[PDB]
Amino acid sequence: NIDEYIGFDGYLALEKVLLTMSPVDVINEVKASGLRGRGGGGFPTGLKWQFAHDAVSEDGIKYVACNADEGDPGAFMDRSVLEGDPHAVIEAMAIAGYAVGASKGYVYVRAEYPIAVNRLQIAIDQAKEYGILGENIFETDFSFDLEIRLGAGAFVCGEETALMNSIEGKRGEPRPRPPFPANKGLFGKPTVLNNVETYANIPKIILNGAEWFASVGTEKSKGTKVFALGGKINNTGLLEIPMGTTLREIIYEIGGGIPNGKAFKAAQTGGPSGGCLPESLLDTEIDYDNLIAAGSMMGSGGLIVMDEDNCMVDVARFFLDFTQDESCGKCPPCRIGTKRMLEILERICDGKGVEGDIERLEELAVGIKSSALCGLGQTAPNPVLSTIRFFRDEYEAHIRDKKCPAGVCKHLLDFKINADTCKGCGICAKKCPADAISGEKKKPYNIDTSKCIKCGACIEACPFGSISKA
Amino acid sequence: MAELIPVENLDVVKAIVAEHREVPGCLMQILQETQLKYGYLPLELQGTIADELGIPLTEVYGVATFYSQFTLKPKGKYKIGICLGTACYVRGSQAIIDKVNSVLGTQVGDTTDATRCVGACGLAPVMMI
Amino acid sequence: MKEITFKINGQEMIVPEGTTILEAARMNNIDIPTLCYLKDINEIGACRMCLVEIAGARALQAACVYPVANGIEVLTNSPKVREARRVNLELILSNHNRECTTCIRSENCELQTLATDLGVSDIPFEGEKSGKLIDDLSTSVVRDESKCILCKRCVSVCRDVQSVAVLGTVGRGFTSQVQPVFNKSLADVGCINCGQCIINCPVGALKEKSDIQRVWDAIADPSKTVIVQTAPAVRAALGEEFGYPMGTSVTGKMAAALRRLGFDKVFDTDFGADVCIMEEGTELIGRVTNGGVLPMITSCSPGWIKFIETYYPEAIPHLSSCKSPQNITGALLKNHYAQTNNIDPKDMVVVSIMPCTAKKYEVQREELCTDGNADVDISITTRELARMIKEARILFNKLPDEDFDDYYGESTGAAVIFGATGGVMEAAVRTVADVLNKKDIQEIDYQIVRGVDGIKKASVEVTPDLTVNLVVAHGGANIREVMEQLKAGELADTHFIELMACPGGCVNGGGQPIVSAKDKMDIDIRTERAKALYDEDANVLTYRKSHQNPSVIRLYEEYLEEPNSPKAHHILHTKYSAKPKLV
C-alpha cells in the first residue's frame, strides 16, 4: 500500500535532497557514517561513488543498478525486504541517481519467486502515478527512469561483472579487472552496483543523521548487520543484531539453544564461501576483520549450526558439490581443479584413501586461492582451509582407524545387534538384500560385515530397533 | 498447455520478437516462455527464430547450454519422478530402482528424471507421474 | 595520445594509453609466458600462465589483461609467482593425453616448451578426463577433444575475423567443450574449410586427414604413372620447417628432391594460371562488349565460392564459368598429353600441392569431371609434403638445382606474382591493356579505404573510352561487408571484385607449417613472403607478360582453337549450383 507507506514517513528523503543539498554533500555524509559494502566486498561504499561521479564519460550518461540476487542456499535475506517494503528500495536509486547524475537504470529479479515479482511491479506502477519515478521528479529538472529485468538467479551470475554481461545477453562471463565496472561497465561507461541491504539504510541516514549510525558499533565497522540463521536449531526465524555480537550469546539466549538436548560442536557462516566456527571461539566478536583471521567470510548472512550426529567429512563435501556445478568453467583452477579434491575424500569416505594425503590438500589449497579468476575459486577451499586448522585429528579416524564416530559416513561402518533388547524376530533378515544376516527364532540374529553393502535396510526392518552403527 | 508445433511458433514469434533494445535480452524472456508452454527447446526452430532475428545460432545455443534453467528434448510419453532428497536418501529407494531395472527397462538418467525436494517430506519417497 | 608512467623492475618508462605490461616488457627485453593471448583477436587471459606480481595487490594479476597505471612498481621473479604457475601448470597438464610420441606437431607444440621450461618434475595428479568421441567424418578437418585445453582462440578466430561463427562452448564443468551447433559433424554445417580454424589452435586438437597411404599405393604400382605438381607459392614455406632464415628459395633443391623420390613427371601451376588469366580476359572482353552481368567475379579460391553458394544463392549470375587453375591443368594433362603420348587416361595419376585446405573439398565434388573422370584424383598439402619428405628424410641442405620439363613448366613473372594478394587482377589488366590498347604496365596505384584494412580500391584507365574500377577484398570480414554493400547494389559502378577466402593471400594459407605467436610479434610473416616473391619476380630474365608466351598460343592454334570456343565451352567452362544450408 502506497498510502500506508507514506504514513510511515514515506518518500520524505527524496523531498529534502532535491531541494536543499548538493550531490557533493550526500557523498560526504556516508563517509561520516562509516558504511562499507555488505555484499561481501568489504570496500568503503562511499569511496566508490567518488570514482563514479568524477570519471570521464564519452557520452555524459551514467548507469546505476541494484543487486537483488541471493546466492547462499537457505539465505532468505534479500527476499524479505523485497516482499516487506519495496517502496524504500525504488526510492533509494532516485537518491543514487541524484548523486552521480543517472537517468536510467535496471532492477534484476529472479523469475523463480512469484511472491515478490508480481508485488514489485505493483510498486513501480503506483510510484509513477504520483510522479516519483519518471520525469519532473518533485518539480525538478532531473529525469530518472527504470525498467524491470527478469533474471532467474544463476549462482555464478552473482559476480559484479556477471551482472553486466547478464543484461548484455551473453553468457555469465566474468572478465578480469581493471578496467573496473565503476570505470568501464555497461557499454564502456561507468556503472554503480550495490546490494539491497545497502539501499535499506539510505533513507535512514539522510533523515536521522549519519552520527547515529556511527554511534552504534565498533570503530572499524560502524552500523548494524542482519543475518538469517539456520541449521539444527530450536527456533528458526529472522534476527536484527547490532555490531558487537559474540557467538555464545547468539546461539543460546537468542537462538534458543541446541534442540533435543544435544551439544554444540561447530557453526558454519557465510555459506560455501565462509567456514565452520567451532566452540573454541564462541566468545569472539563477529566482524570483517575478526572472521578473516578466523578463516571465514560473512557471505550472504546465513548461519549453519551443527551437532554431533554429522560427519565433519560429510559436511566438507556438502558445500563444494554445490559449487562444482556452479563454476562457469573458464579458469582452469575453477574448472578441473575443483573435482581434484572430490576424488580425494571420495576414496576416503569409502576407505580407499591412503597415508600421507593429509598434507596433500594444502598444495592445491594455495593454488586455487591464488590464481582464481572469479570469486568462487579462492573461496572454494575456504571450508577446506578452516576444517584442517581446527579439526585436523579426526581425519585419521577415517584414514587409520577406519571408523566414523558420527555414524552417517556410510561406507566404513558396521552394524551390531543389542542382544538384550532384540528379540530375534528375523524380520531384518528377510529384508536384507545381501543375505548377510543369520540367526534363529527367539535369538538375536548375527551379522556378517563382509557381505553387507551397508545399505542399512535392516535397521528399520527391526521393529525393536536394537541394531547399532558399530 | 502445449499446443504443438505450428501455430505457437507463428503466434509467439511473429508477436514478441519484433522489438528494439535487449540484444539477446528479451529473447531469454521468450526462452522461458517456450518452457512455459512447450516443456522443451526446439532444435530445428532455433534456426527459424534466428533467421527471423538475422543473428547466427552460436550465441543462442551457447545461452541454451550455459544455464541449466530449463529443459531439453527427452520426453517419450511419461515421466517417473523418484523423490531422492536427503530425507528421502535416509529412507532410500534403491531397491525400487533395481525393481524397475528388471521389469521396466534401463537405470536412472535415460528415457525408456531427478527431482529436488518439493514439499511433504514426511511421506518419503514420492512417486511423481 | 596520453602519456602514463610506470616502473618495471626499477626502470622507469613512459608509454601511451592502451599499453599493457606484457608488450611493454617485451619492448623492454623482458619475456613472459602466454597461451591465452594473440594480437588484436583473443584477449581473455583465461590461460592464467601470464601471471606477474604487482605490489600492493590482494592476489596476482594476469599481465596480458592488466592495464597500466601511474607509478606502480612490479616484479616478476618471486617465489610466489613461480610456485603459483607451477601449481597451475601441474593442474592444466592433467587433461591432454601425455602420449606425445603421437602428437601431430610434436616438437613444435609450445605446451611442451612450457613443460621443459618451467621445470615440471612429477605428475602427482591422476584422474579421469572428459567424454571422448572422434568426428573423423569430415573430409578436411578432424577434431579430437582429448588434446584440447579450451583456450577459446579457435572459436574467437572463426567468430570475428572470419565472420563465420559456427563454433561455440557447451556444458558446465568438464562438460564444457568446444563444439559446433547441435553436435553434428562439420561436414553438414556451414563450415567453410577456412583453415584458420586449424592454424591457430595451440594443441593440435585440429588436424588434417593424413591421406598418405594411397599416395604410397599409387606410387607402389609400376603400371600407374604419377605426375606431381607445385603451387606457385609453396617454396617460401619449406625452409620454415627446415629452420632456414627468412625467405630462402629452395626451388631447384625441392625439384631435385622430388626427382630423387622417383616421381615420373614434374610440373607447375604457372602455365595453367597463365591460360586461366588469358581466358578470364577473354570473357572480360565478351561480357563488356555484350553488356553482360556486372560486376564479374573470378573463381580462384574454392572457399569463398562455397561460402556464397551455401549462404547467398541469389548471387549466382555474377560468377565466372571457368574453374581454378589446378583443375584446368588436370584436364589439359589428361586430354592433350594423353592423346599425344597414347597413354590411357585411367592409367595415369596426378597429384598436386596447394596450401589452401578447401581444395580437399572440391576433389570430393563430382561435377568437376571430364568424360565422367575426375580432373585430379589426389592432392596433398605443404605440411603433408613435409611429413612425407621427413619420411624420406633426405639430407635436404646439400642438393643441387634442376629445372622442370617441356612444354608445360615455363616461367613468367606475371604468374610469379599470382600467389600474392591481387596479382591476378594485375596480370588481367596487363593482358587486357596489351590486347586492346598495347599498354605495358607493371604496378598499379592503390588507395586503401580509411579505417578498414584488407579492402582496396583503384581506378585504372584501361582505354581512354572505358575506365575499369578495381576492388580487392581479402579476409572474411572484408568479404562479408562487400557482400552486404553489393546486396544493396551500392557498387554497381565497378567491374572487378576480388574475393579471397584467406586473409593476407595464399602466402598466409592453411597448409603452411606452424609459426609460434612469439615470432608473429616481431615481423608479420606475409611481409617476408612478399619480399621473397618479389625478388623471385624481379629476377625473371625472359618474360614479364602472360600471353606473350609461345607455348600457350602453340596449344591454342594446335588443339584448343581460340578461347571461348564451343569445345572449350564444354571442357573449360561449367555451371555451379546452390548447396543446402543447415546452420
Ligand SMILES: NC(=O)c1ccc[n+]([C@@H]2O[C@H](COP(=O)([O-])OP(=O)(O)OC[C@H]3O[C@@H](n4cnc5c(N)ncnc54)[C@H](O)[C@@H]3O)[C@@H](O)[C@H]2O)c1
Ligand atoms: N555475496 C556473495 O554471494 C559472494 C559470493 C562469494 C564471495 N563473495 C565475497 O565478495 C568478495 C568480492 O570478491 P573480490 O574480493 O575478488 O573483489 P573486490 O575486491 O573487487 O570486491 C568487490 C567490490 O570491491 C570493489 N573494489 C575492490 N577493490 C577496489 C579498488 N581498488 N577500487 C575500487 N573499487 C574496488 C569492486 O568495485 C567491487 O564493487 C569476495 O572476496 C568474497 O569475500 C560474495
Ligand SMILES: Cc1cc2nc3c(=O)[nH]c(=O)nc-3n(C[C@H](O)[C@H](O)[C@H](O)COP(=O)(O)O)c2cc1C
Ligand atoms: C563470485 C562472486 C559472487 C557474488 N555473488 C553475489 C550475490 O549473489 N549477491 C550479492 O548481493 N552479491 C555478490 N557478490 C558481491 C558483488 O560483487 C557486489 O559486491 C554486490 O553486488 C554489491 O555489494 P557491495 O555493496 O558490497 O558492493 C559476489 C561477488 C563475487 C566475487
Ligand code: SF4
Ligand atoms: S574461478 Fe575460473 S572457472 Fe571458476 S567461475 Fe571464476 S573464471 Fe570460471
Ligand code: SF4
Ligand atoms: S546393511 Fe543392508 S546388506 Fe547389510 S545386513 Fe543390513 S540390509 Fe543386509
Ligand code: SF4
Ligand atoms: S534386528 Fe530386529 S528384526 Fe532383526 S532379528 Fe533382531 S529383533 Fe528381529
Ligand code: SF4
Ligand atoms: S599438443 Fe599435447 S600431445 Fe601434442 S606434443 Fe604438445 S603436449 Fe604432446
Ligand code: SF4
Ligand atoms: S580446439 Fe584448440 S583453439 Fe579451440 S579452444 Fe580448444 S585448444 Fe583452443
Ligand code: SF4
Ligand atoms: S574451417 Fe573455417 S568455418 Fe570451419 S572452424 Fe575453421 S575457420 Fe571456422
Ligand code: SF4
Ligand atoms: S586464399 Fe586461402 S583459402 Fe583461398 S585458396 Fe588461397 S590459401 Fe586457400
Ligand code: FES
Ligand atoms: S526431499 Fe523428498 S519430499 Fe522432501
Ligand code: FES
Ligand atoms: S594470456 Fe596468459 S594470462 Fe593472459
Ligand SMILES: [Zn+2]
Ligand atoms: Zn565419516
